[PDB]
Request: fold
Amino acid sequence: RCKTCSKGRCRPKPNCG
Reply:
């Protein structure tokens, strides 16, 4: 549960790929 979805956008984490 490291990946987070921005407000409206959904992208991978910088360190948690």
Notes: The two ends are 11 Å apart (CA to CA). Residues 7 and 14 are 16 Å apart (CA to CA).
